[PDB]
Structure formats: structure tokens, C-alpha cells
Symmetry: C2
């Protein structure tokens, strides 16, 4: 295991016909993760071969959309900021790396 | 998503030559999970086609080994309780089900 770090990535997505931006938005201060209590806006899924393929990943935390902070915002507010975008959505995310435990032993 | 539940399972494992019980032990009060801070003893991995196959799963929390509680014990104490077992190890675990979020929206 290793201590957590979060790599920051900024991308610009373009809408595809019938797919939208092709990302699933979860989290929000009024919509915490059931296991952790975490309130961050989160990319919880990514559409296969959609606009976000190879750019965004499951579990990415959304920090900003088109210059608007996602810090401690409600679910609908994040959804509305993305939905109201035109051809492009500029999105900055933090992507977790690391985890596990200091010690693990096979028995 | 759904609220978490943990299904309790008790199994009796028998050692196989060259594999032991075929489980990886992590967690402990002196060995918390790097992301969650969780101190439970945890089955963090299971050997392919070993004694535990189809019986224990990655992320199972260990509650008891051979009548000895694992509640808030140190990593080495859990390891020693398993290691000192003869042919059989009776193990009770709690297995998480559920998670996610109340709301998820595709954009």
C-alpha cells in the first residue's frame, strides 16, 4: 500500500449525438457516498467509446466545470453546470492513486 | 446505490501444501487502511483455487478466528492466531453489500 495522492487533470469534452458528454455524475453535499460519507462530486461511470473515453475515469472527483467550482455543491447544481454547457465542457478533476495498507501477510 | 449491510459468514478452512490457508491478511488497529482509516482485520486477497476459493472474498472483514475475537486487534495478533492453527481454521467474517449513492445522473 501507499499513502493517497490525487493527480489533477483538466480536459475539454465535446458532446456526441445520443451520448451527451458520456459521463455519470454522483456525489454532492446532499448526496454523499453510502459507504464513506464523501460529499465530492464524482464521475461514477464513463460511457464506452464516448467523448470521455481515455480522458476521464470512474472515481475521478470533479473540482471545476467551465470555471465554476464544485467545492461542496449539491448534486443538481453540478448536473446543471454540465447540462447547460454548449459544444464544450471544460472539466478539472482529481484522480486518486495509492491506497491499501502498510502491512499485508499471507497465511 | 443502497445503504451498506454486512452478511456474516462462518467457514472452516483446511491448509493445502504450499498454499497455507491461501488468504492475505491486512488491517489491524496499528495498520489502518490508507484511504478510509479503517482498522478492521481484512481479507485483502484470496489465492486462486486455494483452500478459501468460493468461501472467502477480497474485502471480507475478519471478526473471529477459532473462537478468538479480532475486534480492534493488532495486525500481528491476527496473523499469529491464523498461523498457529493446525489443520483447521474456523473463521467468521462480515461481507459488505451495497454502497454507491442515492442519486446518479448521466450528462
Amino acid at each position: 500500500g501507499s499513502h493517497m495522492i490525487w493527480e489533477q487533470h483538466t480536459v475539454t469534452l465535446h458532446r456526441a449525438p445520443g451520448f451527451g458528454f458520456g459521463i455519470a455524475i454522483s456525489g454532492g453535499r446532499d448526496n454523499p457516498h453510502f459507504q464513506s460519507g464523501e460529499t465530492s462530486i464524482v464521475i461514477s461511470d464513463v460511457l464506452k467509446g464516448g467523448p470521455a473515453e481515455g480522458q476521464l475515469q470512474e472515481n475521478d472527483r470533479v473540482a471545476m466545470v467551465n470555471g465554476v467550482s464544485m467545492d461542496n455543491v449539491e448534486h443538481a447544481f453540478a448536473v446543471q453546470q454540465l447540462r447547460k454547457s454548449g459544444k464544450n465542457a471544460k472539466i478539472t478533476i482529481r484522480r486518486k492513486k495509492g491506497g491499501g495498507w502498510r502491512r499485508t501477510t499471507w497465511v
